[PDB]
Amino acid sequence: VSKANVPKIDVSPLFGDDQAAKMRVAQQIDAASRDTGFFYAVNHGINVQRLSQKTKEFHMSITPEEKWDLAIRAYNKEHQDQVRAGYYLSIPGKKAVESFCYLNPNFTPDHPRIQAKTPTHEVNVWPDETKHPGFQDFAEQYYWDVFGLSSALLKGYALALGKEENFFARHFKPDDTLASVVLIRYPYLDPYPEAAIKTAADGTKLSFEWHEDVSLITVLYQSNVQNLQVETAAGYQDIEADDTGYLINCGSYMAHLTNNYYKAPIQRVKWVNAERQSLPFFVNLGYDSVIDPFDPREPNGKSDREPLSYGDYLQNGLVSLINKNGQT
Numbered sequence: 001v002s003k004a005n006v007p008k009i010d011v012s013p014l015f016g017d018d019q020a021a022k023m024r025v026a027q028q029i030d031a032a033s034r035d036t037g038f039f040y041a042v043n044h045g046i047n048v049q050r051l052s053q054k055t056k057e058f059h060m061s062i063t064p065e066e067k068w069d070l071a072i073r074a075y076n077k078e079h080q081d082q083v084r085a086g087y088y089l090s091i092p093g094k095k096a097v098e099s100f101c102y103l104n105p106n107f108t109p110d111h112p113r114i115q116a117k118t119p120t121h122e123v124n125v126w127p128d129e130t131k132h133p134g135f136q137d138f139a140e141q142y143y144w145d146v147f148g149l150s151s152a153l154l155k156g157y158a159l160a161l162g163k164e165e166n167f168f169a170r171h172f173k174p175d176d177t178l179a180s181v182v183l184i185r186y187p188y189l190d191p192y193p194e195a196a197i198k199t200a201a202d203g204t205k206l207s208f209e210w211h212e213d214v215s216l217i218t219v220l221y222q223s224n225v226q227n228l229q230v231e232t233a234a235g236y237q238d239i240e241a242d243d244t245g246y247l248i249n250c251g252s253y254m255a256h257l258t259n260n261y262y263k264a265p266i267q268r269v270k271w272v273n274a275e276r277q278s279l280p281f282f283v284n285l286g287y288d289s290v291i292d293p294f295d296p297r298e299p300n301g302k303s304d305r306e307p308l309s310y311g312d313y314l315q316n317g318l319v320s321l322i323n324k325n326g327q328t
């Protein structure tokens with residue numbers, strides 16, 4: 001198995017006012033998006049030093065009682081409103097991974113989308129503060145920290161596609177973004193349940209099968225344990241780990257609106273018997289956000305594809321991923 005070209009791109013110019021420097025970042029994003037589809041954003045300004053420890057301590061300190069109390073609808077029929085946000089329980093002997101997902105902290109009972117019961121909008125559930133001191137504060141701060149990084153990255157993608165730098169970020173707003181964070185724990189298990197291991201067509205043992213991200217872009221931090229693979233025409237290639245950079249790639253919404261110029265890479269997770277943490281931030285727009293498709297491969301830039309409302313796209317994408325790759 002070969003290794004994917006995943007360049008490290010210094011994205012710090014995307015926070016500044018040096019427009020030519022931003023174009024040089026955009027060029028690198030373009031090249032990476034046209035190659036394997038991945039790059040590492042470095043010099044990003046986020047303090048990732050304790051992210052994995054906090055994630056690990058939370059999952060290892062939360063009790064079965066608390067897990068049920070926070071569980072999403074898939075694990076607790078009492079919580080019919082929790083489709084996205086809440087705890088995703090492991091099933092010992094069957095399912096190793098466990099996780100906790102939260103949404104826009106601004107989704108409160110006062111929010112008109114909560115008032116209207118619009119799909120994909122939910123009020124976050126949180127554990128008891130005294131049992132997990134500082135956890136909710138850390139989590140909400142992280143949401144906005146990575147929101148800021150993602151907003152700059154979207155300026156890079158816009159410039160890379162020949163657009164004004166706010167072409168994407170104008171739709172990415174704190175008051176309505178459907179973006180999510182997931183704090184995922186992959187445990188070390190001895191013995192590891194074979195039932196939790198899937199075998200790929202090529203014989204690779206996997207924890208999670210091939211998929212395309214449901215997002216505009218995905219902004220991912222992982223602990224330093226190699227696991228991800230990207231599919232190329234020559235087969236699946238290992239994505240090396242990087243314990244300070246953020247792994248970036250385009251989701252299927254970007255593939256749609258660019259007429260497949262920036263494809264959504266097919267990715268999978270190799271099975272590794274190791275304690276590790278995976279923290280994706282899914283850059284989602286607002287429920288009614290619509291981006292008009294274009295084709296950067298055409299002189300007139302014209303695409304015949306339908307503009308897609310992002311909320312309906314997200315609703316369809318998340319259900320499809322569950323149906324295909326199972327409930328996480």
Ligand SMILES: CC(C)[C@@H](NC(=O)[C@H](CS)NC(=O)CCC[C@H](N)C(=O)O)C(=O)O
Nearest residue numbers: 084101180184208211220269278280282328
């Ligand atoms: C890096 C990825 C492969 C990561 N997995 C993931 O990101 C997984 C599987 S593709 N993502 C999802 O299932 C979509 C989560 C959407 C979230 N609940 C929401 O409501 O917005 C991992 O480490 O497992």
Ligand SMILES: [Fe+3]
Nearest residue numbers: 211212213267
């Ligand atoms: Fe993915």
